[PDB]
């Protein structure tokens, strides 16, 4: 069987991502190369053509706002016409253009080249960085992963996330629903009875609520509901609009035309929002904000709440849907688990606690890391070789699937909250061509819901004496993703042909070209780490030799007047050179380490 290596759990978030591994009976949430247990979901290309991912990308946003990409999870697996896309791209500083009926990200990548990236490619870069983070920690290559998606992600969003994994060079062994991952983190340890858990997951971009039963390592989602375009970024945009209006009224200046000013505001609005979760006012200040003038304003918690009042209130509707679909009531809920960074907001915690008549949420759950933690547990389990415990997940599809057969019945096929994997088959006795449209959602007329895809059965040969009998199977797999297959039942032959979605999913050929492009940048990442790692070595040697030559008792007291002049000099000579050659290639740094060795060694061995 396949050696899957160390399987990592990656929470791929709208604003932050987080990677974990299960080793020696516990989860390690892995710190990145800057020491942060979460990594911004940001990519950028510097004017010189270098790809930054994570903190470095976020840190240069104000200086380079058109070639910095973030919030790709709000675009991934969506079509251009999607009204959520059309709303969102108005507030994103990078260009988004239509390609293959989809929103592509267009940025300048250096060398005078403009490149268009699929959202899957941007998310792939973020997953690469998470993978790079895990590899540095484990001191070995990572080939396999569990990656998270919102419970309410549709089929295309699900598939596009898995594709992002493939592009990043990861075999995604499992797509796991964010609230299900969170439930594992709550429930793993627990030596207790059967519990009804409500997970309320409000992140940077998406909202999910899932109701689970948990009993001795058995986790079952009874019902899920959410909103894939509601999160922290939305609250910021509400505050941004307020202050753009305030500044215009106060000064006459409409700053919307100036990306740099807008991104400086957004940066400070984000910090202020966070501050308002622990204080009742926050100051927003920007030195030379616009045309040389200072921005200085205060935001109150009351005002923050008022600006977002409808959005915060709307989070209760999913809670009510899951309770109704589960056939439970409020008092049946044993624990409330808050996850996602936005659950820090006091008004959100208050709405949830009030809804549950004063009940305290479950304590000790880090809302930014719980999802990755659970993912890492499932990944530990899929590894085989871990001290995890027994873990049995039964999750559900979020959306009712229905079909529209042209010249046939329109019909509901698989209700929302059906345990996956699941399937349903339909016989078509029409012959000729059969075109089937699949829809996702809860509106009673099937075709008023979201179009998942169009599927054509093309080749039906003649059956002299028998009936045209094509059986189409609609299967939702353990990743929550639909496969449509067709088999001829009148013949005897058992040929389960996969019917391909005409709503342009990435083909294996297209995916592989994106892989090749990603691998080119990964090569550069490899060189750079290697080059910096040696420059660091040479610089560490040198500055540590400065505190040994500067050890007048030990090594210093040994050296003569002739020796230490041909030593203190060699050290300073090297530091001097280092200070003017930070950009030098991996060759040169080896040389100068060796030059500083062949001049130090003869002396130190006397």
Ligand X SMILES: Nc1ncnc2c1ncn2[C@@H]1O[C@H](COP(=O)(O)O)[C@@H](O)[C@H]1O
Q: Could you say which of 7, 9, 15, 39 contacts ligand X (CB under 6 A)?
A: 15
| 276 is an annotated ligand-binding site residue | yes
Residues that bind Mg ion (rule: CB under 5 A) add up to a total of 6
Q: Does 123 bind Mg ion (CB under 5 A)?
A: no
Smaller CB distance to Mg ion: residue 14 or 224? 14
Smaller CB distance to Mg ion: residue 239 or 401? 239
Q: How far apart are CA 240 and CA 246, in angstroms?
A: 10
Q: Could you say which of 8, 10, 16, 484 contacts ligand X (CB under 6 A)?
A: 16
Candidates 55, 155, 163, 178; catalytic one: 178
Q: Could you say which of 6, 15, 177, 225 contacts Mg ion (CB under 5 A)?
A: 15
519 is a catalytic site residue = no
**Binding to ligand X in span 528-587, by CB under 6 A:** none
Q: Does 345 bind ligand X (CB under 6 A)?
A: yes
Q: Does 169 bind ligand X (CB under 6 A)?
A: no
Q: How far apart are CA 32 and CA 275, in angstroms?
A: 24
| 375 is an annotated ligand-binding site residue | no
Smaller CB distance to ligand X: residue 8 or 345? 345
Place of tokens 């929103």: 103
Contact 145, 162 (CB under 8 A): no
Handedness of CA 49, 51, 56, 57 (dihedral sign): positive
Name the minimum Å distance from CB 45 to ligand X: 24
Smaller CB distance to ligand X: residue 253 or 274? 274
DSSP state of 7: P
> What angle is formed at CA 500 by the lines to CA 497 and CA 505, rounded to 5 degrees?
150
Q: Could you say which of 6, 14, 263, 342 contacts Mg ion (CB under 5 A)?
A: 14
| 98 is an annotated ligand-binding site residue | no
Of 519, 423, 520, 509, nearest to 472 (Cα)? 423
Output the CA–CA distances (angstroms, integers) from residue 416 to 399, 431, 454, 476, 544, in the order listed. 5, 31, 20, 12, 64
Q: Could you say which of 16, 235, 289, 304 contacts Mg ion (CB under 5 A)?
A: 16
Please report which residue ranges of 546-567 form alpha helices under DSSP H: 555-558, 561-565
178 is a catalytic site residue = yes
524 is a catalytic site residue = no
Name the minimum Å distance from CB 149 to Mg ion: 13
11 is a catalytic site residue = yes
Q: Pick the stretch among 13-21, 107-115, 507-515, 521-529 that binds ligand X (CB under 6 A).
A: 13-21
Name the minimum Å distance from CB 421 to ligand X: 29
Q: How far apart are CA 180 and CA 186, in angstroms?
A: 10
| 104 is an annotated ligand-binding site residue | no
Candidates 28, 120, 201, 488; catalytic one: 201
For the chain, how are helix, strand and coil distributed in percent, rounded to 5?
Answer: 40, 25, 35
Residue 527 CB contacts under 8 Å (≥ 6 apart), including other chains: 586
Q: Does 88 bind ligand X (CB under 6 A)?
A: no
Name the minimum Å distance from CB 159 to Mg ion: 21
DSSP state of 408: S
Of 193, 236, 218, nearest to 342 (Cα)? 236
Q: Does 187 bind Mg ion (CB under 5 A)?
A: no
Q: Could you say which of 203, 318, 468, 480 contacts ligand X (CB under 6 A)?
A: 203
Contact 507, 203 (CB under 8 A): no
Of 389, 553, 532, 393, nearest to 56 (Cα)? 532
Smaller CB distance to ligand X: residue 232 or 480? 232
Contact 92, 78 (CB under 8 A): no
| 326 is an annotated ligand-binding site residue | no
Output the CA–CA distances (angstroms, integers) from residue 467 to 12, 267, 461, in the order listed. 49, 66, 11
Q: Does 308 bind ligand X (CB under 6 A)?
A: no
> What angle is formed at CA 229 by the lines to CA 223 and CA 233, rounded to 5 degrees?
125
Tell me the residue nearest to ligand X as measured from the CB. 232
Residues annotated in a binding site: 13-16, 73, 204-206, 270-277, 341-344
Instruction: Give me the residues that bind Mg ion (CB under 5 A), please.
Output: 13-16, 203-204
Q: Which residues bind ligand X (CB under 6 A)?
A: 13, 15-16, 38, 203-204, 231-233, 270, 273-274, 277, 340-342, 344-345, 367-368
Catalytic positions are: 11, 73, 178, 201
Annotated binding site for ATP: 13-16, 73, 204-206, 270-277, 341-344
């Amino acid at each position: 069987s396949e050696d899957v290596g160390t399987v990592v759990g990656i929470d791929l978030g709208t604003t932050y991502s987080c990677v974990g591994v299960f080793k020696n009976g516990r989860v390690e949430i892995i710190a990145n190369d800057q020491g942060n247990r979460i990594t911004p979901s940001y990519v950028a290309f510097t004017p010189e053509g270098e790809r930054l991912i994570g903190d470095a990308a976020k840190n240069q946003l104000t200086s380079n706002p058109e070639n910095t990409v973030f919030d790709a999870k709000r675009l991934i697996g969506r079509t251009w016409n999607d009204p959520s896309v059309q709303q969102d791209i108005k507030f994103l500083p990078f260009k988004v253009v239509e390609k293959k009926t989809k929103p592509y990200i267009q940025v300048d990548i250096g060398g005078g080249q403009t490149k268009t990236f699929a959202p899957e490619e941007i998310s792939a870069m973020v997953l690469t960085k998470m993978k790079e983070t895990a590899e540095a920690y484990l001191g070995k290559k990572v080939t396999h992963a569990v990656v998270t998606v919102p419970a309410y992600f549709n089929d295309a969003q699900r598939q596009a996330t898995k594709d992002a994994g493939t592009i990043a060079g990861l075999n995604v062994m499992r797509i796991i629903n964010e609230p299900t991952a969170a439930a594992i983190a709550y429930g793993l340890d627990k030596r207790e009875g059967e519990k009804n858990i409500l997970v309320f997951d409000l992140g940077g971009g998406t909202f999910d609520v899932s109701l689970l039963t948990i009993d001795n390592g058995v986790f079952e989602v009874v019902a899920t509901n959410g909103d894939t375009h509601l999160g922290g970024e939305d609250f910021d945009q509400r505050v941004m609009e307020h202050f753009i209006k305030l500044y215009k009224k106060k000064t006459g200046k409409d700053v919307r035309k100036d990306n740099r000013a807008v991104q400086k505001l957004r940066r400070e609005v984000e910090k202020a929002k966070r501050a308002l979760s622990s204080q009742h006012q926050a100051r927003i200040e920007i030195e030379s904000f616009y045309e040389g003038e200072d921005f200085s304003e205060t935001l109150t918690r009351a005002k923050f709440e008022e600006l977002n009042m409808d959005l915060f209130r709307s989070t209760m509707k999913p809670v009510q849907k899951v309770l109704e679909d589960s056939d439970l009531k409020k008092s049946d809920i044993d624990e409330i688990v808050l996850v996602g960074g936005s659950t820090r907001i006091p008004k959100i915690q208050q709405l949830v606690k009030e809804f549950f008549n004063g009940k305290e949420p479950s304590r000790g759950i880090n809302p930014d890391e719980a999802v990755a933690y659970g993912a890492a547990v499932q990944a530990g389990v899929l590894s085989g070789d871990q001290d995890t415990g027994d873990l049995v997940l039964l999750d559900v599809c979020p959306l009712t699937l229905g079909i529209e057969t042209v010249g046939g019945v329109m019909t509901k096929l698989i209700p929302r909250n059906t345990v996956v994997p699941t399937k349903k088959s339909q016989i078509f006795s029409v012959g000729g061509t059969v075109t089937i449209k699949v829809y996702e959602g809860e509106r009673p007329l099937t075709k008023d819901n979201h179009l998942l895809g169009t599927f054509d059965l093309t080749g039906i040969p003649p059956a002299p004496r028998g009936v045209p009998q094509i059986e189409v199977t609609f299967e939702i797999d353990v990743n929550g993703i639909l496969r449509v297959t067709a088999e001829d039942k009148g013949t005897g032959n058992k040929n389960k042909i996969t019917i391909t979605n005409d709503q342009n999913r990435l083909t294996p050929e297209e995916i592989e070209r994106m892989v090749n492009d990603a691998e080119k940048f990964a090569e550069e990442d490899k060189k750079l780490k290697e080059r910096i790692d040696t420059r660091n070595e040479l610089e560490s040697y040198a500055y540590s030799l400065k505190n040994q030559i500067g050890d007048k008792e030990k090594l210093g007291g040994k050296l003569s007047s002739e020796d230490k002049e041909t030593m203190e000099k060699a050290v300073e000579e090297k530091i001097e050179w280092l200070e003017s050659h930070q950009d030098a290639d991996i060759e040169d740094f080896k040389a100068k380490k060796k030059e500083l060795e062949e001049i130090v060694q003869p002396i130190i061995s006397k």
